[PDB]
């Protein structure tokens, strides 16, 4: 129970999410010394739930052990979309179906 921060390595991942979800928080990971900077920033707002997307899993097993939390690797939109639903019962969106 507490902040859902969405951890992107791009800026068009960041725009997306931050659109599609203004009810999380993004951080934008453009060299390690960021990565760095998010391992301090979970720890600071107290963050249990960190989702890694497309993430090197370098970076992966980093933050996850030293921020000591629980990492959602995130390869796709889809799987972003459900952890933020996750965290947030009340959703203020609709998650698109696939077949």
């Not at 301090?40 to 997307?53: A, C, H, M, N, P």
């Not at 052990?65 to 969106?93: C, F, H, I, M, P």
Request: glycine letters at 6%; a positive charge.
């Amino acid at each position: 129970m507490g902040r859902l921060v969405v951890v992107v390595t791009s800026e068009q991942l960041k725009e997306e999410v931050r659109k599609k979800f203004p009810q999380v928080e993004v951080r934008l990971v453009t060299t390690e010394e960021d990565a760095k900077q998010v391992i301090k920033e979970i720890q600071k707002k107290g963050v249990q739930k960190v989702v890694l997307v497309g993430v090197s899993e370098k970076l992966l097993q980093k933050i996850k052990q030293e921020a000591n939390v629980q990492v959602y690797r995130v390869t796709s939109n889809d799987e972003l979309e459900q952890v933020v639903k996750d965290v947030k019962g009340s959703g203020l969106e609709h998650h698109h179906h696939h077949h």
